[PDB]
Amino acid sequence: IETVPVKLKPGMDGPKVKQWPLTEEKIKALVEICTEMEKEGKISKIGPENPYNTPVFAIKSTKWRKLVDFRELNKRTQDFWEVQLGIPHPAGLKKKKSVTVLDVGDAYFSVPLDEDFRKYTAFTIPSINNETPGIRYQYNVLPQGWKGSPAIFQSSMTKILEPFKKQNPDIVIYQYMDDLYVGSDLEIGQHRTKIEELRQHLLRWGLTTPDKKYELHPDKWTVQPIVLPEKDSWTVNDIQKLVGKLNWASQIYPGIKVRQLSKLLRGTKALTEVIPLTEEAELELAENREILKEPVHGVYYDPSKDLIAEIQKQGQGQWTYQIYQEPFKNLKTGKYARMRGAHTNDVKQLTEAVQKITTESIVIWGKTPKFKLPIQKETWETWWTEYWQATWIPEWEFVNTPPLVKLWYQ
Amino acid sequence: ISPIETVPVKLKPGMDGPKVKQWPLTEEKIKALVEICTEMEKEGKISKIGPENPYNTPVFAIKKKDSTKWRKLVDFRELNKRTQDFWEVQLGIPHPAGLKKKKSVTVLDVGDAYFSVPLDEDFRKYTAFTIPSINNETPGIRYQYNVLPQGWKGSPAIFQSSMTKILEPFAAQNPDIVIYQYMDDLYVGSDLEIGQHRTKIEELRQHLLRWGLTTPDKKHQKEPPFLWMGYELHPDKWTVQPIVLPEKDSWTVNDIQKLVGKLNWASQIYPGIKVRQLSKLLRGTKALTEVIPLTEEAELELAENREILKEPVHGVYYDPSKDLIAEIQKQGQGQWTYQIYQEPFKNLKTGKYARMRGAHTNDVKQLTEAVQKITTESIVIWGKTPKFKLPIQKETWETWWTEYWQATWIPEWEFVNTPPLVKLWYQLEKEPIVGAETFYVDGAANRETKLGKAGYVTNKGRQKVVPLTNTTNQKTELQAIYLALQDSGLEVNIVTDSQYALGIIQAQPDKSESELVNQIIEQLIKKEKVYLAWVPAHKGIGGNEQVDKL
Ligand SMILES: N#Cc1ccc2c(Oc3ccccc3OCCn3ccc(=S)[nH]c3=O)cccc2c1
Ligand SMILES: [Cl-]
Ligand SMILES: [Cl-]
Ligand SMILES: [Cl-]
């Protein structure tokens, strides 16, 4: 068929991002993958009159998979896939009991890409020790990881899904980049059989989904409540920490009172001294505990602002996160605990946590947040692709300031 | 010229060709220009044009050694500023430690390289120039370029693509011959017998000549050692070109920068080079021609470098069949040095890491940072990460990374018991110490007066307040803790309201740019148990209120 013209935002030049150096093992995998893609027409080699570039990576199973980081090109094509060809986000997918994610990225590879736009998809396969300038390619078809690919394919996808939507009018289907999110209130077995029905329907229509032998239950998605320490007996230190955390919580929840607790510790006492609480003091504790049990007031999602995810390392394979748009206005908080395993590199847990947070943010708001990552920039840039199993890549930055508030977000 | 296919070139969108003025020149200049423009036109690299072309570009004439040659110069700045961007030519160069030994290596220099590659026809009209009349009475000689002009934005990258395509047929016929490409040169290696290799070199030359590229004969072909990019490439070893550290009485900022540069350059193969003290002098250099004094530490550091540089050192080329090993040693002063080797007495390369940015640091964190720098470099040079040999015990590192706030990647490493070792010099208590005096400390200062005070009150009734001059609200908060570290037993509980001071100590540094923090570190090592606790200031909670009286 004829191609949909793609125009960059006016006055915006193409992506000119640097290629990271890669292991020899990963370079060879990329050369192999790209040689096959060139044979199938999906990509072609290009000359020096193309100045643009987009990073490429190799990820894994036992088979090497290629991953293009289209973050920059997506920003420079936002109008094309967000305004002109935007895909609306359903607000009922979060309400579903079970949500399954299906990879439908292979559909794009049939559809040709606008000839005048191919130059902006240029990527470079790096050489070792700067021996070679690099193998340079550009896409001839809609590339995976570009946000205009699902936007262009949208009408074909809506058509292929319509017969299944008619039969199953209570099933929510939402497309974000290369994935379909399918949510139903059915029992797990019914939902699983429904997912296979959709997989077979898509296969009947020519959409291979590599799901041959991700289940998410979003009913539990909420802002977790702050939990004050419960103690049979209380020391000066214990009251001190309790008062401090309550004062920090007062920034979020107004109405916290600690004046009675402050009086309970009087004089230059000893930290290990055991101070029993006053009747008045317990009343303040009981009021603050109930005040924190309720959710915050007036915290709404602003779709004109960007979502922000903050993560803090807690130890013993436990991580906590907050998603917000303005300070102390958390839209979502959670605690990701690594599935207990031998392999436990903090990078692996951080990488797995970032993927979990990003998927929830897609299901809840239809967009990804920008992460504040508690890791050194170079360490993450070196090792993040080792455990990366997603097709998208969120924005991120690195925080060099230790929090000092880790206990507070417990 | 050549039969190579021309790369299509566009002007930057919304721009047009360069229409620049041609200022007159002397008669001997206009003469030597025509003596070259007629010989350039003869070889087809330029061509006379008519008035229809509306563009123009300045032409100048200059000579070397007042030699017979009077080279032409064209300033293509206006065109270059209006031409499309191209793929960026090679930025970094191969490192000698990443080369693999070939039984024979040859170097070939391409002559007239840019002028031997044709230029896109539709783009030639924007390259026009003029040789002026003797007195602006005669008409000018309009001309135009047919090949890649020297000093044009696209010339370097179009040549490299043309050369790479030209090499493709020979490379397919000769799959065992390695050909490095770099600017106007080709570095050809092989594992063939000298006579067999010399025949393949002559084969490459003839192939390159049919494509229009001239190349030196064996009479003019160089021989090892090759002096490439400040290196010395020998048939079985590599090292840097000789370093010259000048002797001077007055060292200007520029001179110090050059000295620090040569020393960094020498550090890739000479182990132990240090540039901390010399670089510290550079801090706030400002004027490059300013004369700066030398610290006794700086002269000592420079003296040790001269001692290191006195004897020569060389590195080895890379062998993919052997392991890649990295070993790190702490030099002191926040400086580390490392070697990368596969065999014991020969190193592929060396280097050093300094944490200049952080005021407060922990040896373990620095070691982790240095590992990261080596890992990135190993990937660039060899395409893989090394097996590390580090002066730290597993229980020491496992303790640090377990409790560190950031995520850390600890690769394969084995302990090397070669002091200075890396250890945890102290550790704060995770819970308060029963049977220990509890100091409630506080401090403050006035910003205008710069006069402050630091004091404490303890649960046993002890009280002190000390005056401080020329201090900060931050320094006094650290002074309060230092006062309580002193005047206390081997086990002490310290309660502060300063999140700043708590943050610095909780990071558990072992060195800093503050003498006060260095003194606090000394106390923390000398103590047995220290628990540092924090409370909100001005909350009037317990002891803190009484200390706040200070
Ligand atoms: N000026 C110049 C210049 C000269 C040679 C270069 C170079 O040579 C090779 C070229 C091809 C394969 C291996 C090479 O090098 C292996 C190691 N090696 C090096 C030298 C000798 S004499 N013998 C030997 O084994 C690679 C890169 C840049 C070069 C620049
Ligand atoms: Cl731009
Ligand atoms: Cl450094
Ligand atoms: Cl002491």
Task: CATH number of the domain at B267, please.
Answer: 3.30.70.270
Which residues of B line the annotated binding site? 109, 184-185, 442, 477, 497, 548
B171 is in which domain, residue-wise? 90-114+156-224
Which strand (E) or helix (H) includes residue B335? strand B335-341
Same-domain check for residues B33 and B19: yes
Length of chain B in terms of residues written = 550
Resolution in A: 2.4
Give dist(CA B232, CA B225) in Å, integer: 6
Query: Pocket of ligand 1, candidates B99, B176, B238: which has the most ligand atoms within 8 Å of its Cβ, to mutate?
Result: B99
Q: H or E stretch including A398?
A: strand A396-398
What is the spatial distance between Cα B91 and Cα A133, in angstroms, rounded to a whole number?
A: 9
Specify the DSSP element, H or E, that contains A43.
Answer: strand A43-45
Q: In whole angstroms, give the CA distance from residue B443 to residue B437.
A: 19
Whether B194 contacts chain A with CB within 8 A: no
**Domain check: are B431 and B286 in the same one?**
no
**Do A280 and A368 belong to one domain?**
no
B516-B520-B522 Cα angle (round to 5)? 115
Residue B138's CB is within 10 A of a number of other CB atoms, namely: 10
CATH code of the domain containing A58: 3.10.10.10
φ and ψ at residue B87, rounded to 5 degrees = -60, 135
Q: How far apart, in Å, are the Cα atoms of B509 and each of A20, A241, A378, B334, B493?
A: 33, 24, 22, 12, 19
| Domain at A184, CATH number | 3.30.70.270
DSSP string covering A149-196: HHHHHHHHHHHHHHHHHHH-TT-EEEEETTEEEEEE-S-HHHHHHHHH
Which residues neighbour B439 within 8 Å (Cβ) at sequence distance 6 or greater? B456, B457, B458, B484, B488, B492, B493, B494, B495
The CA-CA-CA angle for residues B314, B318, B319, to 5°, reads: 130
Does A51 sit within 8 Å of B85, measured CB to CB? yes
Token readout for A135 is: 């193998």
What 3-state class would DSSP assign to B57?
A: coil
Same-domain check for residues A226 and A295? yes
Contact A250, A256 (CB under 8 A): yes
A28 and A151 housed in the same domain: yes
Does A152 lie in the same domain as A25? yes
Q: Are A111 and A122 in contact (CB under 8 A)?
A: no
For the Cβ of B231 lying below 6 angstroms from any atom of ligand 1, the answer is no
Neighbours of B271 (CB within 10 A): 17
Burial of residue A227 (CB within 10 Å: 0-12, 13-18, 19+) is: exposed
Angstrom distances, CA of residue A336 to CA of A355, A393, B97, B116, B238 = 11, 19, 44, 63, 51
Range(s) of the domain holding residue A333: 302-409
List, in sequence order, every residue forming a beta bridge with A16; answer none if it has no partner: A53
Residue B406 shares a structural domain with residue B456: no
Question: How far is Cα B421 from Cα B351, in angstroms, rounded to an integer?
Answer: 19
Q: Which member of B161, B385, B407 has the closest CB to residue A375?
A: B407
Count structural domains, chain B.
5
Distance B375 CA to ligand 3 centre (A): 14
Please give the method by which this entry was determined.
X-ray
Are residues B476 and B512 located together in one domain of the fold?
A: yes
Task: Point out which residues pair with A174 in neighbouring strands.
Answer: A181
Cβ-proximal residues to A185 (8 Å cutoff; 6+ apart), any chain: A96, A97, A98, A170
- Phi first, then psi, for residue B537 (nearest 5°) are -75, 155
Cis peptide bond prior to B3, omega within 30° of 0? no
Tokens standing for residue B445: 């200062």
Same domain, A127 and A173: no
A153 and A9 part of one domain = yes
One-letter amino acid for residue B282 of the chain: L
A11 contact partners, CB below 8 Å, separation of at least 6: none
Cα(B524) to centroid of ligand 4, in Å?
Answer: 8
B139 C-alpha to center of ligand 1: Å?
53
Using an 8 Å Cβ cutoff, are A144 and A68 in contact?
yes
User: Is B90 near chain A, with CB under 8 Å?
Assistant: yes
What's the Cα-to-Cα distance from B254 to each of B281, B286, B296, B354, B515, rounded to whole Å?
12, 10, 20, 22, 31
Same domain for B382 and B396, yes or no, is yes
Ligand nearest to the CA of B268: 3
Whether the ω angle into residue A210 lies within 30 degrees of 0, i.e. cis, is no
Among residues B318, B341, B358, the one where a domain terminates is B318
**Could you give the C-alpha distances from A39 to A36, A42, B28, in angstroms and in order?**
5, 8, 60
- In whole angstroms, what is the distance from residue B205 CA to residue B223 CA? 17
* A192 and A234 belong to one structural domain: no
Report whether A72 contacts A396 (CB < 8 A).
Answer: no
Strand order in the sheet with A308-315: A332-337, A318-324, A308-315, A370-373, A396-398
> Which amino acid is present at B97?
A
With a CB cutoff of 8 Å and minimum separation 6, the contacts of B141 are B34, B37, B48, B130, B131
Local structure of B500: helix, strand or coil: helix
Q: Are residues B4 and B43 in the same domain?
A: yes
For residue A399, the SS3 value is coil
Mind giving me the DSSP string for B168-228? HHHHHH-TT-EEEEETTEEEEEESS-HHHHHHHHHHHHHHHHHTT-B---TTT---SSEEE
Pairwise CA distance, residues A98 & B77, whole Å:
63
Distance from C-alpha of A169 to C-alpha of A164, rounded to nearest angstrom: 8
Compute CA distances A92 → A171, A295, A368, whole Å: 10, 21, 18
Q: Which residue, among A212, A179, A208, has the nearest Cα to A103 in the 3D structure?
A: A179
For residue B42, the domain's CATH number is 3.10.10.10
Closest CB to A271 among B93, B181, B432: B432
Residues from chain B that touch A133, judged by Cβ atoms under 8 A, are: 87, 89-90, 160, 164, 181
B401, B407, B459 member nearest A270 (Cβ): B459
d(CA A239, CA A281): 11
Tell whether A187 and A246 lie within a shared domain.
no
Distance CA A362, CA A355 (A): 11
Q: Which residues contact A29 (CB under 8 A, 6 or more apart)?
A: A58, A64, A66
A249/A346 same-domain check: no
Nearest CA-CA distance, residue A65 and chain B, Å = 19
Please classify residue B509 by burial: count the beta carbons closer than 10 Å to its beta carbon, then call 0-12 exposed, 13-18 middle and 19+ buried.
buried
How far apart, in Å, are the Cα atoms of B203 and each of B165, B178, B196, B358, B465?
Answer: 17, 14, 11, 57, 89
Give the Cα separation of B438 and B498 in Å (integer). Answer: 16
Which two tokens mark A247?
């004062």
- B162 with B149, same domain: the answer is no
CB atoms within 10 A of CB A39: 9
Residues A191, A314, single domain; the answer is no
Beta carbons within 10 angstroms of residue B348's beta carbon: 28
Are both B457 and B548 inside the same structural domain? yes
SS (H, E, C) A279-297: HHHHHHHHHHHHHHHCCCC
Residue A77, SS3 per DSSP: coil
Give the pair of three-digit tokens for residue A32.
């192999």
* Beta-ladder partners of B83: B11
- Residue A316, Ramachandran bin (φ over 0: left; ψ between -120 and 50: alpha; else beta): left
Cβ neighbours for B241, distance < 8 A, ≥ 6 positions apart:
B227, B230, B231, B232
Euclidean distance between CA atoms A66 and A57, whole angstroms: 6
Long-range contacts of B68-73, Cβ-Cβ distance < 8 Å, separation of 24 or more: B70/B29, B70/B32, B70/B33, B70/B35, B70/B36, B71/B36, B72/B33, B72/B36, B72/B37
DSSP A19: P
Q: Three-state SS for B457? A: strand
Measured by CA distance, the residue closest to atom 1 of ligand 1 is B228
| Shared domain check, B131 and B26 | yes
Same domain, B107 and B121: no
B233 lines ligand 1 (CB under 6 A): yes
Q: Among A236, A271, A301, where does a domain finish?
A: A301
Q: Report the number of distinct structural domains present in chain A.
A: 4
User: Closest residue (by CA) to atom 6 of ligand 1?
Assistant: B187
Within this chain, do residues B59 and B197 fall inside the same structural domain, yes or no? no
Residues B18, B126, single domain; the answer is yes
CA-wise closest residue to A318 among A277, A290, A279, A346: A346
d(CA A69, CA B536) in angstroms, rounded, equals 45
Chain B closest CA to A52's CA: distance in Å? 7
Q: Which residues pair with A318 in a beta bridge?
A: A315, A337
Query: Token pair of B20, please?
Result: 């620049």
